[PDB]
Amino acid sequence: GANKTVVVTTILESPYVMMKKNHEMLEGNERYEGYCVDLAAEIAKHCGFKYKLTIVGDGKYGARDADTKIWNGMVGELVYGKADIAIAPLTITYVREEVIDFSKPFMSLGISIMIKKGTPIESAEDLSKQTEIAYGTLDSGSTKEFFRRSKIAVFDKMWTYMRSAEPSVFVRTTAEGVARVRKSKGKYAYLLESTMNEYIEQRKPCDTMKVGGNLDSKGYGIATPKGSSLGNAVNLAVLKLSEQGLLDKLKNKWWYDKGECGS
Amino acid sequence: GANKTVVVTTILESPYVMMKKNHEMLEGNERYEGYCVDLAAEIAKHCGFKYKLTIVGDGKYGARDADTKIWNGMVGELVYGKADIAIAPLTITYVREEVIDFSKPFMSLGISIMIKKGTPIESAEDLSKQTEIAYGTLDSGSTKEFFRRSKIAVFDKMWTYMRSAEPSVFVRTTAEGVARVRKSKGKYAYLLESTMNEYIEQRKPCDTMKVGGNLDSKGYGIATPKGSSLGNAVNLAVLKLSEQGLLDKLKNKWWYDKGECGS
Ligand SMILES: O=S1(=O)CC[C@@H](C2CC2)c2ccc(F)cc21
Ligand SMILES: O=S1(=O)CC[C@@H](C2CC2)c2ccc(F)cc21
Ligand SMILES: N[C@@H](CCC(=O)O)C(=O)O
Ligand SMILES: N[C@@H](CCC(=O)O)C(=O)O
Ligand SMILES: C[As](C)(=O)[O-]
Ligand SMILES: C[As](C)(=O)[O-]
Ligand SMILES: [Cl-]
Ligand SMILES: [Cl-]
Ligand SMILES: [Cl-]
Ligand SMILES: [Cl-]
Numbered sequence: 001g002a003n004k005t006v007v008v009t010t011i012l013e014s015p016y017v018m019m020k021k022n023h024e025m026l027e028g029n030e031r032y033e034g035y036c037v038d039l040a041a042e043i044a045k046h047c048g049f050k051y052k053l054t055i056v057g058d059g060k061y062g063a064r065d066a067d068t069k070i071w072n073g074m075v076g077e078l079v080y081g082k083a084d085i086a087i088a089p090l091t092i093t094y095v096r097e098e099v100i101d102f103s104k105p106f107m108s109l110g111i112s113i114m115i116k117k118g119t120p121i122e123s124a125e126d127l128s129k130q131t132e133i134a135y136g137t138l139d140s141g142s143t144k145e146f147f148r149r150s151k152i153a154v155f156d157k158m159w160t161y162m163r164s165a166e167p168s169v170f171v172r173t174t175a176e177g178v179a180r181v182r183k184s185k186g187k188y189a190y191l192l193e194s195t196m197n198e199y200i201e202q203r204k205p206c207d208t209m210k211v212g213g214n215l216d217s218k219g220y221g222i223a224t225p226k227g228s229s230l231g232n233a234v235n236l237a238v239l240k241l242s243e244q245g246l247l248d249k250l251k252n253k254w255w256y257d258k259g260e261c262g263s
Numbered sequence: 264g265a266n267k268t269v270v271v272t273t274i275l276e277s278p279y280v281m282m283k284k285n286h287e288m289l290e291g292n293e294r295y296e297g298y299c300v301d302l303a304a305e306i307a308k309h310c311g312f313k314y315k316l317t318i319v320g321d322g323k324y325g326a327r328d329a330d331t332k333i334w335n336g337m338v339g340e341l342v343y344g345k346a347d348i349a350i351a352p353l354t355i356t357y358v359r360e361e362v363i364d365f366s367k368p369f370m371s372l373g374i375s376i377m378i379k380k381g382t383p384i385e386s387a388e389d390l391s392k393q394t395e396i397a398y399g400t401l402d403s404g405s406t407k408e409f410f411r412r413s414k415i416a417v418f419d420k421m422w423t424y425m426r427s428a429e430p431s432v433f434v435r436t437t438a439e440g441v442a443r444v445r446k447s448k449g450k451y452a453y454l455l456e457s458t459m460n461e462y463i464e465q466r467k468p469c470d471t472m473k474v475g476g477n478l479d480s481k482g483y484g485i486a487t488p489k490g491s492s493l494g495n496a497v498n499l500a501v502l503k504l505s506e507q508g509l510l511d512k513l514k515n516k517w518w519y520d521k522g523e524c525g526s
């Protein structure tokens with residue numbers, strides 16, 4: 001039928017989607033800024049659709065409850081028909097690809113370690129061989145699932161510790177994990193995706209750093225419900241933006257051009 | 264109908280697919296070794312098919328002739344029904360994704376610079392600002408197309424030089440490009456994918472090196488003809504192998520465990 005405004009689900013996560021300063025009482029898409037706001041504008045332009053940005057109701061990325069089998073987060077909004085597309089730092093995973101469609105990745109990342117500067121930790125192995133420094137992940141995302149599912153000795157040892165550690169080492173938002181690192185005097189390290197780690201490393205007060213290599217290698221993709229008519233065009237649009245260098249320009253724009261910790 | 268042996272097209276490119284020493288007179292898949300041989304075995308196992316490895320007849324990756332509009336290389340073998348699947352260092356690109364299907368990537372790479380050690384070159388900008396040192400690409404692949412299509416000032420300048428340079432700066436195989444670097448006393452630099460660059464850097468006589476950052480960011484994917492019944496299962500299999508850490512183990516096995524230039 002007639003063209004319809006596409007409902008985009010996304011998540012308030014810096015620097016992907018942020019409320020512009022003093023824009024809370026304004027309307028529509030102009031309230032928001034960030035890498036994924038710019039990406040949504042390009043994808044929509046290349047695919048020829050109008051869209052409305054909406055923030056996922058429960059503030060989550062997406063996981064399947066083991067008991068009820070219900071999907072939450074942005075994945076759930078696609079699965080249950082609340083949104084037409086997710087344009088967000090949403091990680092491509094096997095269990096998600098079974099229930100939604102992902103474009104080719106628009107950004108690469110891996111799980112990484114954030115420390116407060118000076119923390120005597122250089123690797124995941126270092127974390128796993130000690131107990132003075134606590135460590136955790138975002139509480140309902142692909143990083144937590146990576147540790148839950150891993151059969152690699154070091155990551156299995158870390159999961160065995162994290163899943164029963166008290167108080168909980170898991171946090172509700174990236175901002176909570178960063179704040180916990182910054183206030184714990186070196187006694188908390190946060191396991192998060194390298195993209196968010198490297199963004200925070202360039203933000204005042206410049207007191208965190210990414211240490212060691214990444215624990216895995218994957219990417220974010222644009223997600224659509226299974227069988228959506230948008231998937232084919234969205235996928236090609238990502239590849240076009242990649243080959244044009246636009247994705248590189250946007251990463252520099254939101255990570256490093258605006259860095260607050262020097263050159 | 265009944266299960267049929269899947270015809271795999273691939274390419275003789277180290278360390279992805281190599282003839283085992285003294286295996287030329289043997290038969291079937293056991294003749295070959297490499298990263299993509301190991302990957303094919305896993306993909307076939309996870310998808311439940313038997314397969315036959317075949318080397319692409321024309322030795323090419325795949326490009327579309329501007330005059331005849333015919334696809335060559337492994338892409339052509341899929342397009343024209345000569346093979347059922349390509350398991351190879353085949354780069355995900357927009358023009359290929361229009362005519363074949365790609366899985367999610369199984370390996371990341373970017374275009375990079377190979378120099379003979381000691382060459383006074385650190386970047387693509389350095390190459391573009393001088394003429395003493397020639398530079399080129401593989402003659403019928405995604406790297407050449409990257410330069411042909413780029414609107415970025417430095418890469419446009421490099422393309423303007425490469426496309427009319429005489430003798431040709433393009434080579435027929437990666438091995439030819441490496442040999443040209445090694446014998447040109449520093450007066451030829453080779454533009455190739457970072458994966459092949461970093462492999463050769465660890466091979467005797469240990470006289471080349473990768474310099475500068477990568478020029479772009481992309482990946483290899485497993486390719487199937489449009490609408491093939493294999494695509495969905497192959498795509499999930501790649502993600503499963505990724506999440507299990509198998510792709511990481513295979514990269515280490517074929518790049519660094521067997522490195523000949525020290526630790
Ligand atoms: O779509 S993926 O998650 C498939 C797995 C890995 C591949 C195995 C190296 C990967 C890497 C970069 C990226 F940007 C996305 C992805
Ligand atoms: O499937 S891709 O070619 C889509 C573009 C880039 C994305 C833009 C960063 C990418 C990166 C790693 C990889 F392994 C594959 C690909
Ligand atoms: N990008 C992740 C969320 C962040 C994390 O888990 O580290 C996801 O899609 O679940
Ligand atoms: N992987 C490339 C070939 C090598 C290159 O062009 O550098 C392709 O699929 O065309
Ligand atoms: C339920 As708990 C181990 O995250 O506090
Ligand atoms: C046709 As030519 C410029 O590669 O020798
Ligand atoms: Cl808009
Ligand atoms: Cl997941
Ligand atoms: Cl912009
Ligand atoms: Cl076999």
Ligand SMILES: [Cl-]
Pocket residue numbers: 356357358359404405408
């Ligand atoms: Cl191409």
Ligand SMILES: [Cl-]
Pocket residue numbers: 301516
């Ligand atoms: Cl093995």
Ligand SMILES: [Zn+2]
Pocket residue numbers: 156159160
């Ligand atoms: Zn365990």
Ligand SMILES: [Zn+2]
Pocket residue numbers: 210
């Ligand atoms: Zn760093």
Ligand SMILES: [Zn+2]
Pocket residue numbers: 419422423
């Ligand atoms: Zn030009």
Ligand SMILES: [Zn+2]
Pocket residue numbers: 473
């Ligand atoms: Zn290097």
